[PDB]
Amino acid sequence: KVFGRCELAAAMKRHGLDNYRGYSLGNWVCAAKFESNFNTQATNRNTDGSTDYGILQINSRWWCNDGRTPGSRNLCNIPCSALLSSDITASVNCAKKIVSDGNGMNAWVAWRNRCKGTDVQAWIRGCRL
Ligand SMILES: [Cl-]
Ligand SMILES: [Cl-]
Ligand SMILES: [Cl-]
Ligand code: NA
Ligand SMILES: [Ru+3]
Known about the structure:
By secondary structure, the protein is mainly α. It contains 4 helices and 3 strands.
């Protein structure tokens, strides 16, 4: 599923991501935009052989199991495919664990490089939330 910008904002809020660990909703929407262009099916192989999955491109190196990332962990206790569902619950639940890991949203390199410090509120501007 390819979410619209305000549609994703609303689903993220419903699932408790707005202001989670202090990150406003615009930050999450901006992270999703650059990580997956709002497409729940997005996948990208990393150089190290791990793979990022879903709206927030969660990495199999640590967070989900894909059966093909040697030596990795599955800290969200989920098959990576769950992260590609039209329903974003699994991605959100696992994102909450990632963002609580110590480095906040810097765990998402696109958020640090393209969202951090910017006017992220623009991402939820005009949305009926
Ligand atoms: Cl594996
Ligand atoms: Cl959803
Ligand atoms: Cl933080
Ligand atoms: Na893994
Ligand atoms: Ru839902």
